[model samples]
Target chain A: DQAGITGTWYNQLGSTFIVTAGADGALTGTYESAVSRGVRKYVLTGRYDSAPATDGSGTALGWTVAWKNNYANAHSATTWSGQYVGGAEARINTQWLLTVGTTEANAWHSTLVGHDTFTKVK
Target chain B: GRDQAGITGTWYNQLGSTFIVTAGADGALTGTYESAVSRGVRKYVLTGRYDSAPATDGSGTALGWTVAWKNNYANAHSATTWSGQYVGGAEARINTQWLLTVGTTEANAWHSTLVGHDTFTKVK
Candidate 1:
């Protein structure tokens, strides 16, 4: 069922996350950050739990994207992990951890943990 | 993109639980949470993220956070996280979906992993 996580998605950042295919083991997708307009979309790869959470919550979901040499070339990639809640307005609650490049890393920044909720747009 | 300023500060849920957002750096969030589940003033650690840095105007519509309880597992065994949105109007509010995650070792736990929705507004 892909837990209804296929097609185009939008976030508060005015960014984009599109799942070209939501196959069982692996998902293929693309992400574009509104913060970096016209830079070109990055790649997204993901997977869901083989079985539902033993507790039976929405299927456990996870996805990742590599930023490559984007702006300032400050980041490596980011992984978003969360669960999809189904309803009239479906939502995916995700937490993300970001890694910085060597220079940014040596300074010992907090690795910057963040969260975003994705809502299906199309 | 929206502004992060729209969601920073204190908020309360309909359940009498309070959320104090202390930081919104880049896309990361840091805060404290006092749950009605305990009815105590003791605060718990909270952190979360927005989709990106706020818009030039500094506002956003959606984000999420997780609050972990310390050793209160006997009565409140699960960790709490929320997926939320900022609704701007005369009365700005936050609408959220919450999930409580229980441990895998717990036995015969029914309804242990729970999810629900709650709406919150900035503290008045």
Candidate 2:
């Protein structure tokens, strides 16, 4: 269900993001972390889709969330995809593309890629 | 020793910076990364001293490199550090602070506390 992507998810780096979806399938969330200091709280909004399978065969019974974060003058984006492993356990893979700032015609783009496990807590 | 761990050479990044360093037999690396033009600044410079050692934490039992560096912007002086692990004969995985000096003073600063595993490749 699309609702599976909604909830509080935390990573090993002490960062967290809370996801919520609207009746119209609009996705929204808040991500906070000290690593992104000046841009600590990221306001995100996007949509949800089906995530690919681990075996590269077909779509998995999971959700893929894509979001854009525009904060502190930077235009950044991220994608998180995962499926439940058990009753409350989920493994997620994340990919991010960030720009230093948006004022310039061209800004340096940095990429961040990683994965983590999330346990539902409410 | 032809530069400790083959660190005596030049390396470049997409950010338009050229890193030139020399290493000693005792595993001491000294160098500077010069940006011909950075953030509208004519000449941007970052200097550092690094030493190789075994990682104390994490799941690794292999040797890694540690660096203490400083940004040499006349009025916006700031210190930075890096921790990295070699990723083959010609590449490395470096984790460090991302500091952006937006002005001539420290007041105009924008940065991140950590940028994990920014890969670096040897160019020269």
Candidate 3:
């Protein structure tokens, strides 16, 4: 036994895609700005999933990616406002890739949205 | 007490990934506690692994990822205990790597947990 899966994924926070992806019941990943991004030290807690278009439809499908941050006190309410599926498998691994888009929610946000992968060590 | 467990090695977090560390044996911890620290609209996640045949500092050997944190702003800024055996030394930077099974906070400020693995460090 002890056999499982492993990989990384990404997601945006407090917006439509990032919000819906988790609320709509989809893959979720950890969202944290590991390094200092510009003047602001990027920080947040959330999840994400690729869009259907991102992956060709099939039993194995790909949908939008997203997430939400439960910052200590600042955005606690809004953080809970969004929904997310529970349970991350153990022994196995997972990585979430986030593709932040250009919108009001992501304005002042660094352009050239990108994806980040995470691996569950526990 | 027995002074056998010297902290100096690579550990994985509750998330099941690898992180490197190097710290003093003080407070019984000395290593890296990898964490995803970020603020603002960001995606913070990492897939890290140990060096496999790593240079385990001192006599310490790399074990399953050990993630720990403490309330930096608490009257007693000590590491938070999870439902697992914690490994490493007591040096903040040396042991920054962490494994989160559930959601919690550090220093009432930074927060992190296990996400996923595979493409850690983007090994070429």
Best candidate according to DockQ:
2
Assess every candidate by TM-score: 0.44, 0.40, 0.21
lDDT of each: 0.68, 0.45, 0.29
Choose the strongest candidate by TM-score.
Answer: 1
Cα lDDT tens digits for candidate 2, B42-92:
333434444444344442212233333333444434333444433334344
Q: Give the CA lDDT, 0 to 100, for residue A119 in model 2.
A: 49
DockQ per candidate, 2 decimals: 0.02, 0.06, 0.03
Candidate 1, which segments miss by more than 4 Å at Cα?
A: A36-38, A53-56, A69-74, A103-107, B1-124
Per-candidate clashes come to: 9, 0, 72
List of clashing residue pairs for candidate 2: none
True-vs-predicted CA distance for residue A5, candidate 1, Å: 1.3
- Candidate 3: which stretches are off by over 4 Å? A1-59, A65-122, B1-64, B71-124
Error of 3 at B19 (Å): 8.6
DockQ of 3: 0.03
- After TM-score superposition, the amount by which residue A121's alpha carbon in candidate 3 deviates from its true location, in angstroms, is 32
| Order by TM-score, highest first | 1, 2, 3
Model 2 RMSD vs true structure: 9.8
